[PDB]
Structure 1
Amino acid sequence: HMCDAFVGTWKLVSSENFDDYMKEVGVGFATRKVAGMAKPNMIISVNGDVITIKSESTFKNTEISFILGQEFDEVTADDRKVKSTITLDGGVLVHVQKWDGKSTTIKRKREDDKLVVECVMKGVTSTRVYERA
């Protein structure tokens, strides 16, 4: 029953500061413009110890599967090759991506009927709000 409140299909309903987050990460102009326009769904499922997170949009369809605390290699939607570890910290899914001596953290949390995603790169934070589809 790890992660029960995250499981389901979620749709993006608001975004703040996402372009600036992407700039800080190093995403190029054209990808920022097209990715920033995306209205993704996020589909989260659990089977045993394996969590799967899919992101589906007109820009890209991506999927990660992982076990909490166990590092994995990820190719991000902007084509970074990163080493990722996802843990549960006080009910928050904390996703750390490492590449080229850099690091970014993406947190997913349940707040009321929303799934709130906070993306941090150095001092820049983007907040993305999803609701059930």
Structure 2
Amino acid sequence: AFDGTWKVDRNENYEKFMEKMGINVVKRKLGAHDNLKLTITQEGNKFTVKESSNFRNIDVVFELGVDFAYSLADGTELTGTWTMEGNKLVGKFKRVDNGKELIAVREISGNELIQTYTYEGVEAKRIFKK
């Protein structure tokens, strides 16, 4: 259901989320316009996500329910797991550096992929079109 090539269309509250994550103003302004594109293929409970943005092009592979390591654009390391909760992908991560929870949720809403982040009580959404 998540399959295909998704290109970011708009954000909600993403600058405040980046600020909470400790990102400086220049990098927030870059991050607001990162041209994030996700190419997602699901095979059984296994996903491959090609992440392309102005910061980096990387390939992510994960299996539902299996812990993996993932590094953010500035090298900040996360560990966590994606699971399917109803029709939503729920990504439960923790920052290695401070142990704090970072959650990502992926959902289809109509013809859009809604990617929601939470960190320390601050929400952001990045909404993609296919």
- Per the TM superposition, whether the score is higher than 0.5 is yes
Report the secondary structure of 1:59's partner residue.
coil
Partner of 1:96: 92
Equivalents in 2 of 1:30, 1:62: separation in Å?
23
Corresponding position of 1:78: 74
CA-to-aligned-CA distance 1:30-68 (integer Å, 9 cap, x gap)? 432222221211110123432111221222212211110
Where in structure 2 are the equivalents of 1:42-61 lying within 5 Å? 42-61=38-57
Deviations 1:60-103 (A, max 9, x none): 21221111011011111232111121101011011122122211
Go from structure 1 to structure 2 and tell me whether the alpha carbon gap of 1:49 and 1:89 turns closer, same or farther (over 3 Å shift): closer
- How far apart, CA to CA, are the structure 2 residues paired with 1:9 and 1:63? 13
Aligned partner of 1:115 in structure 2 is 113
Tell me, yes or no, if the aligned pair for 1:27 and 1:78 is still in contact at 8 Å: no
Deviates more, 1:118-127 or 1:105-114: 118-127
**Matched positions, count:** 128
Kept in 2, the 8 Å contact 1:12–1:39? The answer is yes
- Percent identity over paired residues: 30
1:15 is matched with which residue: 7, 11, 22?
11
- Measured in 2, the distance between the counterparts of 1:104 and 1:44 equals 21
After TM superposition, the runs of 4+ consecutive aligned structure 1 residues lying more than 4 A away are none
Unpaired runs of at least 5, structure 2: none
Higher helix content, 1 or 2: 1
Higher deviation after alignment, 66-75 or 52-61: 52-61
Aligned-residue offset at 1:18: 0.7
When normalised by structure 1's length, the TM-score is 0.88
Is 1:105 aligned with 2:109?
no
